[PDB]
Amino acid sequence: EIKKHEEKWNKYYGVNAFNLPKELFSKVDEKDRQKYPYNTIGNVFVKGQTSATGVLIGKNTVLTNRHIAKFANGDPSKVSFRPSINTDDNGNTETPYGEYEVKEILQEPFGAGVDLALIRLKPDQNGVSLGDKISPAKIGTSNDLKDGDKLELIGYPFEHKVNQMHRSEIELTTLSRGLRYYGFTVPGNSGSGIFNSNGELVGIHSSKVSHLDREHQINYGVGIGNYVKRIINEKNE
C-alpha cells in the first residue's frame, strides 16, 4: 500500500502542475471569485516573510495557520490581508475590496500544536469592515467527514502562480489521525479553506506531513472539530 499511495500521490505530483487536469487543480476565474465561497478567500501577506492564504470567518476575523502568523512575530503591522487579490499573468494587480490592515494577531488560540491562528482586521479608512462587504464563510464541522470524501481546497498557491486564487480537489484519507488528504498544494496554500459541497468551511489546509512511512507524505489540514469550533465561537468578531 506504499505502492498504492505512491501511485495516487504521483497523480498530483508526477507531472508539472500546469499539466494537471482541471478537475484536480484550476485557476478560479473572475466570475467565480466574486461568488461565495471563493470571495471569502484572501492572501495573508507578511511582507518579506511569507505569502499564504486565509479565510474570512467573521466580520473582522480571518482564520489562517499558526505557522503563517508566526512570521509576524506578534506584530500586527507586519501582516496584511488581501481578499480576492488577483495579479494577472501580465502584472496587473487588483484588490477589489482593498488591502486590510491587522489590528491583532492571536497566534495560537487553539494551542501551539494546532496550526491555526486568528487575525483580527481593522476596518477600512471609512470604517467598513471586510465582513460587511463580504459575507464571512459559513462554519461547518469536520465531525461527519469520512475517508474517501471529496472536498474543495481554495487558496493562493504562491509558488505556482503569484496572487492567483486556485481550487484543488482533495480526497480525504486515514482520518483516525487528523484531516489528511490527497491533493495538489504548495506552501502558499497554507491557510486555504476546505469547503464541502454545501459551501461550509470544514477545515483549513496546513502543510504536508509524513505518511505511512518516514519516506512518504500526505497533505494535512486542521478540521473544524468540536474544539476548534468552540474557540472560534469564543473569539470570533
Swiss-Prot record:
GO MF: serine-type endopeptidase activity; toxin activity
Cysteine pairs bridged by disulfides in the record: none
Segments crossing the lipid bilayer: none
Enzyme class: hydrolase
Domain of life: Bacteria
Enzyme Commission number(s) of this protein: 3.4.21.-
Residue positions of the active site: H67, D115, S190
Keywords for the protein's UniProt record, in alphabetical order: Calcium, Hydrolase, Protease, Serine protease, Signal, Toxin, Virulence
A biological process term (GO) from this entry: symbiont-mediated disruption of host cell-cell adhesion
Entry cofactors: Ca(2+)
General function of this protein: Has serine protease-like properties and binds to the skin protein profilaggrin. Cleaves substrates after acidic residues. Exfoliative toxins cause impetigous diseases commonly referred as staphylococcal scalded skin syndrome (SSSS).
Family: Belongs to the peptidase S1B family.
Protein name: Exfoliative toxin A
